[PDB]
């Protein structure tokens, strides 16, 4: 545990250099051939693209500037890019290029062809505990890294976790990521994964990421979330109650870990106690977990997506396609100066 605090210390210094002086304007749109939509969102979409000069495939997230401003999401969007360009970790998707034009913002990431954890989980139904643990361990290390940089991730869910060609996780969607040293107050996340203190408008901190990890582990192992209903308000009622029931097949160790992660009381939630992340890493459910081996990506993955080539999108759902329009007039230039 002496290797890791020295690792984190060095990690913080390269992050802070990039945080203080972000990269900008490192490619332009006509360097990419757009192939297929991989997912859509409130402000645009993510497309598979091929970089002409290298022939490499990437995932290009496209955001409409006028719509970002209209829906008051400038700070979250600037956060997303400023943080993603500054971080470096084996289970975080890599931002390779970013740029803007008259109409849009563009973030070009490594293409993670294995698809969303979400798709595989719904298809298989549920993951066995060693399978779930293999993924959970990657998130534990990743939150350890992010939180040490004073970052809060705030949208953990299987839809935002991609499976790479090695079967390892790549975290994407930094849309709500925020660098904060105090509490923060934005109601954001995804309903099933919101901690009680978010719902209750109390102010909250990084402990909400650990609550979300409890939800993720539960959903991975059960095949359904711990709190579900047809409408968010009904989901919120269940979350704040904190009553959780476990599937009969959950091990005793898993149930104990989850009781400690899905703890409504901040005072008592694992990840948020005096021993911090080590309460989690030392829990009996992770006794078989070689944390260094995971970080080094030397553990054999329980599942490897099949890919028929670079550019294969068979592990992704289909989406309706749309022309990408770029105005001949600059939109919202001042708002996105730093992008």
């Amino acid at each position: 545990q002496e290797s890791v605090k020295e690792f984190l210390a060095k990690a913080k210094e390269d992050f802070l250099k990039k945080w203080e002086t972000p990269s900008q304007n490192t490619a332009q749109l006509d360097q990419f051939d757009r192939i297929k939509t991989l997912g859509t969102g409130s402000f645009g979409r993510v497309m598979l693209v091929k970089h002409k000069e290298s022939g490499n495939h990437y995932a290009m997230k496209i955001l409409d500037k006028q719509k970002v401003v209209k829906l008051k999401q400038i700070e979250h969007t600037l956060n997303e890019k400023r943080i993603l360009q500054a971080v470096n970790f084996p289970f975080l998707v890599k931002l390779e290029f970013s740029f803007k034009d008259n109409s849009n913002l563009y973030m070009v990431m490594e293409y993670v062809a294995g698809g969303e954890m979400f798709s595989h989980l719904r298809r298989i139904g549920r993951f066995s505990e060693p399978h779930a643990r293999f993924y959970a361990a990657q998130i534990v290390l990743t939150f350890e890294y992010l939180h040490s940089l004073d970052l809060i991730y705030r949208d953990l869910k299987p839809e935002n976790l991609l499976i790479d060609q090695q079967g390892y996780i790549q975290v994407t969607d930094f849309g709500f990521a925020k660098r904060v040293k105090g509490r923060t107050w934005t109601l954001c996340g995804t309903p099933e994964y919101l901690a009680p203190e978010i719902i209750l408008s109390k102010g909250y901190n990084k402990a909400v990421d650990w609550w979300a990890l409890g939800v993720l582990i539960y959903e991975m192992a059960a095949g359904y979330p711990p709190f579900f209903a047809d409408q968010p308000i009904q989901i919120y009622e269940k979350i704040v109650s904190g009553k959780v029931r476990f599937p009969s097949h959950f091990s005793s160790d898993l149930k104990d870990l989850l009781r400690n992660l899905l703890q409504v009381d901040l005072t008592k939630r694992f990840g948020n106690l005096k021993n911090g992340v080590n309460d989690i890493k030392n829990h009996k459910w992770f006794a078989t977990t070689d944390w260094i081996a995971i970080y080094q990506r030397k553990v054999e993955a329980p599942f490897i997506p099949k890919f028929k080539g670079p550019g294969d999108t068979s592990n992704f759902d289909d989406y309706e396609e749309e022309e990408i329009r770029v105005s001949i007039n600059e939109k919202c230039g001042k708002e996105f100066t730093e992008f």
Binding site: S42, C188, T190, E192, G223, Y224, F228, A229
Partner: peptide, 20 residues
């Protein structure tokens, strides 16, 4: 079963984020 109730529910597909 809990699983059957989930699978018959309205939120078994990709879930969008929220903010306000």
């Amino acid at each position: 079963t809990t699983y059957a109730d989930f699978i018959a529910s309205g939120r078994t597909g990709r879930r969008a984020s929220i903010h306000d």
